[PDB]
Scaffold this active site. Structure first.
Site, PDB file in Angstrom:
ATOM      1  N   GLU B  35       0.840  -1.187   0.000  1.00 29.71           N
ATOM      2  CA  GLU B  35       0.000   0.000   0.000  1.00 29.71           C
ATOM      3  C   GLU B  35       0.873   1.233   0.000  1.00 29.71           C
ATOM      4  OE1 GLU B  35      -3.007   0.315  -0.670  1.00 29.71           O
ATOM      5  OE2 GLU B  35      -4.010  -1.634  -0.269  1.00 29.71           O
ATOM      6  N   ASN B  46      -7.389   8.765  -5.931  1.00 30.69           N
ATOM      7  CA  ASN B  46      -8.264   7.810  -6.633  1.00 30.69           C
ATOM      8  C   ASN B  46      -9.041   8.550  -7.716  1.00 30.69           C
ATOM      9  OD1 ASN B  46      -9.005   6.573  -3.409  1.00 30.69           O
ATOM     10  ND2 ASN B  46      -7.527   5.746  -4.903  1.00 30.69           N
ATOM     11  N   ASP B  48     -11.975   8.654  -8.557  1.00 31.37           N
ATOM     12  CA  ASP B  48     -13.246   9.199  -8.113  1.00 31.37           C
ATOM     13  C   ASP B  48     -13.077  10.495  -7.343  1.00 31.37           C
ATOM     14  OD1 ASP B  48     -12.396   8.411  -5.591  1.00 31.37           O
ATOM     15  OD2 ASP B  48     -13.874   6.939  -5.126  1.00 31.37           O
ATOM     16  N   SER B  50     -11.544  10.762  -4.384  1.00 33.26           N
ATOM     17  CA  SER B  50     -11.144  10.446  -3.038  1.00 33.26           C
ATOM     18  C   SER B  50      -9.602  10.245  -3.018  1.00 33.26           C
ATOM     19  CB  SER B  50     -11.843   9.183  -2.560  1.00 33.26           C
ATOM     20  OG  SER B  50     -11.450   8.039  -3.245  1.00 33.26           O
ATOM     21  N   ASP B  52      -6.289   8.130  -0.795  1.00 35.73           N
ATOM     22  CA  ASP B  52      -5.865   7.130   0.158  1.00 35.73           C
ATOM     23  C   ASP B  52      -4.670   7.716   0.967  1.00 35.73           C
ATOM     24  OD1 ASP B  52      -7.644   5.385  -1.050  1.00 35.73           O
ATOM     25  OD2 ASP B  52      -6.065   4.373  -2.183  1.00 35.73           O
ATOM     26  N   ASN B  59      -8.987   5.259   2.741  1.00 41.00           N
ATOM     27  CA  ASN B  59      -9.664   6.034   1.718  1.00 41.00           C
ATOM     28  C   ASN B  59     -10.597   7.031   2.377  1.00 41.00           C
ATOM     29  OD1 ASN B  59     -12.245   6.134  -0.204  1.00 41.00           O
ATOM     30  ND2 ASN B  59     -10.337   5.965  -1.341  1.00 41.00           N
ATOM     31  N   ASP B 101     -15.737  -4.448   8.622  1.00 38.38           N
ATOM     32  CA  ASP B 101     -16.863  -3.882   7.895  1.00 38.38           C
ATOM     33  C   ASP B 101     -17.532  -4.905   7.000  1.00 38.38           C
ATOM     34  OD1 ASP B 101     -18.324  -1.260   7.502  1.00 38.38           O
ATOM     35  OD2 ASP B 101     -17.739  -1.553   5.405  1.00 38.38           O
TER      36      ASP B 101
END
Ligand SMILES: [Cl-]
Ligand SMILES: [Cl-]
Ligand code: NA
Ligand code: NA
Lengths: 129, 129
Positions: B35, B46, B48, B50, B52, B59, B101
């Site tokens: 990562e 990202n 979109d 967003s 990280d 995120n 989650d």
């Protein structure tokens, strides 16, 4: 943190930016607006692999350490994460080094293309300074 | 900060990640390696919009607030900048929420594609744990 316009003007003035190297406070507020939309957490990757950080989008190639910009300096002697804090001290002190470095505020591409020559006074419009 | 491998393993273990939701420590170290290359200051945009953040590339769409990810949540109730600190507490507590989650460590795309099913024990190889 996302600063309000007069809030940021106030913090910048307290930290000595008003007329620093001859640049009035409205220049710095205008620079911040287009760099980061007043968001201390703003980050932007540059094609060269460096990153811009914080309310004034200070670049890792020269100014700060992020441990992922090969062959870069850290002339402000700070971690880049410092430039994302709620408190703009690190960002302001580093900006003073940058703006002194020889090209003044032309260091900020958004300043030169969107603020330079415009009515920068307006950015400190309603503000109790 | 760029952690050394056993350094990070030690911090992750101290903070309760070893076998958290059944995932051994080598899984978390492996996830961190791919990562962020163990760099707490790592950031990645990202498509979109967003971002990280940090050693586990947590995120902004769901987990943290960066003030620039429209219509996102902050389920860990922290600023994203917190995830870039030298101290991995915020990142670890948030990761515990993420991994709980429902998809476990599949939440980390690099984990599923590069760690999952591999010999993750190796990532805690030389380490005095
Ligand atoms: Cl000048
Ligand atoms: Cl699971
Ligand atoms: Na640097
Ligand atoms: Na968010």
């Amino acid at each position: 943190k996302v600063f309000g316009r007069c809030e940021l003007a106030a913090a910048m003035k307290r930290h000595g930016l008003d007329n620093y190297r001859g640049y009035s406070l409205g220049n710095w507020v205008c620079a911040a607006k287009f760099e980061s939309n007043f968001n201390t957490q703003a980050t932007n990757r540059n094609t060269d692999g460096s990153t811009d950080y914080g309310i004034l989008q200070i670049n890792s190639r020269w100014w700060c350490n992020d441990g992922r910009t090969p062959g870069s300096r850290n002339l402000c002697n700070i971690p880049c994460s410092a430039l994302l804090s709620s408190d703009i001290t690190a960002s302001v002190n580093c900006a003073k080094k940058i703006v002194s470095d020889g090209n003044g505020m032309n260091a900020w591409v958004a300043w030169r293309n969107r603020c330079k020559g415009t009515d920068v006074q307006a950015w400190i419009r309603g503000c109790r300074l």
